[PDB]
Amino acid sequence: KTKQGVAEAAGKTKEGVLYVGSKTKEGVVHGVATVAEKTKEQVTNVGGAVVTGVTAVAQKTVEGAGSIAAATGFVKKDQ
Amino acid sequence: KTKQGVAEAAGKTKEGVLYVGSKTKEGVVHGVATVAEKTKEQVTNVGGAVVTGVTAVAQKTVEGAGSIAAATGFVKKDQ
Amino acid sequence: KTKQGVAEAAGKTKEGVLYVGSKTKEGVVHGVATVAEKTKEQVTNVGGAVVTGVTAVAQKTVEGAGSIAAATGFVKKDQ
Amino acid sequence: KTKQGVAEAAGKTKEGVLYVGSKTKEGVVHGVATVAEKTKEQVTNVGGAVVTGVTAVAQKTVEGAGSIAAATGFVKKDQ
Amino acid sequence: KTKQGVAEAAGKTKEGVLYVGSKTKEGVVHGVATVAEKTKEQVTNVGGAVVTGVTAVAQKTVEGAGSIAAATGFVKKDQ
Amino acid sequence: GVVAAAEKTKQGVAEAAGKTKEGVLYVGSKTKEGVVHGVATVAEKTKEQVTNVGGAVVTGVTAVAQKTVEGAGSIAAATGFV
Amino acid sequence: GVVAAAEKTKQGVAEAAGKTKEGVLYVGSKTKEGVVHGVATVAEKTKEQVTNVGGAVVTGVTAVAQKTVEGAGSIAAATGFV
Amino acid sequence: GVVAAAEKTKQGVAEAAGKTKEGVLYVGSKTKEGVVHGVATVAEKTKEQVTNVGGAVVTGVTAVAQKTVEGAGSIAAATGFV
Amino acid sequence: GVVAAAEKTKQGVAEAAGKTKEGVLYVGSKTKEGVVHGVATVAEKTKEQVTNVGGAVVTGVTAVAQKTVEGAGSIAAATGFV
Amino acid sequence: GVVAAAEKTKQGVAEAAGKTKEGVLYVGSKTKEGVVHGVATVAEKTKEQVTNVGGAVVTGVTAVAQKTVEGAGSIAAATGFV
Numbered sequence A, B, C, D, E: 001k002t003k004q005g006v007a008e009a010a011g012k013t014k015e016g017v018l019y020v021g022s023k024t025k026e027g028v029v030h031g032v033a034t035v036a037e038k039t040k041e042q043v044t045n046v047g048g049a050v051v052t053g054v055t056a057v058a059q060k061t062v063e064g065a066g067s068i069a070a071a072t073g074f075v076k077k078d079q
Numbered sequence F, G, H, I, J: 001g002v003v004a005a006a007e008k009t010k011q012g013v014a015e016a017a018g019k020t021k022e023g024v025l026y027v028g029s030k031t032k033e034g035v036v037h038g039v040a041t042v043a044e045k046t047k048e049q050v051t052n053v054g055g056a057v058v059t060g061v062t063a064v065a066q067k068t069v070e071g072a073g074s075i076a077a078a079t080g081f082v
Helices: none
Strands: A007-012 A015-022 A025-037 A040-046 A049-051 A054-062 A068-076 B007-012 B015-022 B025-037 B040-046 B049-051 B054-062 B068-076 C007-012 C015-022 C025-037 C040-046 C049-051 C054-062 C068-076 D007-012 D015-022 D025-037 D040-046 D049-051 D054-062 D068-076 E007-012 E015-022 E025-037 E040-046 E049-051 E054-062 E068-076 F002-007 F011-021 F025-027 F030-053 F056-059 F062-065 F076-080 G002-007 G011-021 G025-027 G030-053 G056-059 G062-065 G076-080 H002-007 H011-021 H025-027 H030-053 H056-059 H062-065 H076-080 I002-007 I011-021 I025-027 I030-053 I056-059 I062-065 I076-080 J002-007 J011-021 J025-027 J030-053 J056-059 J062-065 J076-080
Touching: A007 A015, A015 B007, A015 H030, A015 I030, A025 J025, A040 A049, A040 B049, A049 A068, A049 B068, A054 A068, A054 B025, A054 B068, B007 B015, B015 C007, B015 G030, B015 H030, B025 I025, B025 J025, B040 B049, B040 C049, B040 J011, B049 B068, B049 C068, B054 B068, B054 C025, B054 C068, C007 C015, C015 D007, C015 F030, C015 G030, C025 H025, C025 I025, C040 C049, C040 D049, C040 I011, C040 J011, C049 C068, C049 D068, C054 C068, C054 D025, C054 D068, D007 D015, D015 E007, D015 F030, D025 G025, D025 H025, D040 D049, D040 E049, D040 H011, D040 I011, D049 D068, D049 E068, D054 D068, D054 E025, D054 E068, E007 E015, E025 F025, E025 G025, E040 E049, E040 G011, E040 H011, E049 E068, E054 E068, F002 G011, F030 F056, F030 F062, F030 G062, F056 F076, F056 G030, F076 G056, G002 H011, G030 G056, G030 G062, G030 H062, G056 G076, G056 H030, G076 H056, H002 I011, H030 H056, H030 H062, H030 I062, H056 H076, H056 I030, H076 I056, I002 J011, I030 I056, I030 I062, I030 J062, I056 I076, I056 J030, I076 J056, J030 J056, J030 J062, J056 J076
Parallel strands: A007 B007, A015 B015, A025 B025, A040 B040, A049 B049, A054 B054, A068 B068, B007 C007, B015 C015, B025 C025, B040 C040, B049 C049, B054 C054, B068 C068, C007 D007, C015 D015, C025 D025, C040 D040, C049 D049, C054 D054, C068 D068, D007 E007, D015 E015, D025 E025, D040 E040, D049 E049, D054 E054, D068 E068, F002 G002, F011 G011, F025 G025, F030 G030, F056 G056, F062 G062, F076 G076, G002 H002, G011 H011, G025 H025, G030 H030, G056 H056, G062 H062, G076 H076, H002 I002, H011 I011, H025 I025, H030 I030, H056 I056, H062 I062, H076 I076, I002 J002, I011 J011, I025 J025, I030 J030, I056 J056, I062 J062, I076 J076
Antiparallel strands: A025 A054, B025 B054, C025 C054, D025 D054, E025 E054, F002 F011, G002 G011, H002 H011, I002 I011, J002 J011
């Protein structure tokens, strides 16, 4: 057997109140907050890449090699 | 056997109140908040890529190699 | 056997109130909020790509290699 | 056997109130809110792509390779 | 056997109230809200693509390779 | 004096307003006021005995949801000599 | 005096407002006011005996959700000589 | 005097406002005012006996959620000679 | 006197405001005012006996969540000669 | 006198404001005011006996969450000759 990223909870009682719970988070992006107030932006772009925004990427992959979760603001000119 | 990302909860009682619950999150984007107040943006683009917005991407893949979850604001000119 | 992303809950009692529940989220985008107040945007584009909006993409794929969940604001001129 | 993204709940009692429930979300976009108040936008486009709106895409695919869930605001001139 | 995206709920009692329920969501877009108040938009387009609206796309595909769920605001001039 | 003008254009819009008072607006929202959700009660043996003389009595397993705008909201209200 | 002008343009917008008062607006929001959620009670044996003379009595397993705007909100209200 | 002008342009916007008062706005928010969530009570044997003369009595297992705007909010309110 | 001008441009925006008063705004926020969450009570044997004359009495296992804006918020309120 | 000008440009923005008063804003925040969370009570044997004459009495296992803005917030309030 093999266990990986397993949340196990067990509870036993006879009388009263019993609460049993399990949670699992894998590849999760939570709580991204951004504020821009009275901000001036001037951009001049000629053949390039300019990124000034908000990017939130979450990826979960099983049996995947060479995977890229995020690639933001790049110039690729491979030969 | 093999367990991966498994949330297991077990509860047993005789009298009273019993609560059993399990949750699982894989490749989840949660809670993205953005505010822009009185913001000035001036963009001049000639053949390029400019990204100033909000991007939220969530991807879950099984048996997938070479997968890209997000690719924002890029120039590709491969030969 | 093989378990992947499985939420299992089991409950047993004799008298009273019993609650059993299971939840599963895979490739889910939740809670995206954006506000733009009194914002000035000026864009001049000549043959390029400009993205200033809100993009929310969720993808779940089984047995898929080379899948791209999102590709926003790019210029592709491959030869 | 093989289980993937399975939500299983089991409950057993003799007297009282019993609640059993299971939920499953795969490739789901939930809760996208956007507000634009007193916002000025000026766009001049010549042969390009400009996206300033709201885009929400959800995709679930089985046995699909090379699938693209979303492609927003791009210029493609492959040869 | 093989289970994928299966929500299973089982309940058994003798006396009282029993509730059993199962829900499944795959490729679902839920809850998209947009408000534009006192917003000025000026667009000049010459041979390009400009998108400023709201787009909500949900796609579920079985045994489909190379499927594109959404493609918004693009210029394609492949040779 | 509020003046808006637009001349010698191709597409011109001129809007002028003296006074404005915006209202309430809901878009894709959910509201819950006085809501009872998910109540489970198990009672094997119960016995209720009430002796009332000119009053208000509420007895037993009760689930009450109320929403009053311009009045008094109660469960048992015993007033006299109004 | 509020003046807005736009001349000799191709696309011109001129907006002028004297006074403005924005209101409330909800977008994709959830509101809960006076909500009872998820109450479980188990009582094997219970006995209730009430003797009331001109009052307000509430007895037993009760789940009450209330929302009052311009009034008094209570469970048992006993007033006299109003 | 508030003046906004825009001339000899290709895309011109001129906005002028004398007075402005922004309001409240909710976007993707959750509000909880007077909410009872997740209450579990187990009582094997209970006995309640009430003798009331012109008062307000609340007895037993109670779960009350209230939300009052312009009034008094209580569980048992006994007033006299109002 | 507030003046904003923009001339001899290709894309020009001119905005002028005399007085401004911004309001409250919530984005992706959660608010909890008067919330009771996760209460568990186990009572094997209990006995309640109340003798009341013109008062306010609250007795037993109680879970109360309240939210009052412009009034008095209590559980037992006994006032006289108002 | 507040003056903003922008001339002989390609992309020009001119903004002028006389007086400004920013407000409150929440982004991805959580607020808890008067919240009761995670209370567990175990009581094997209990006995309650109350004799009340014109007062306010609260007795037993109580979990109270309150939020008052413009009023007095209490559990037992006994006032006279208001």
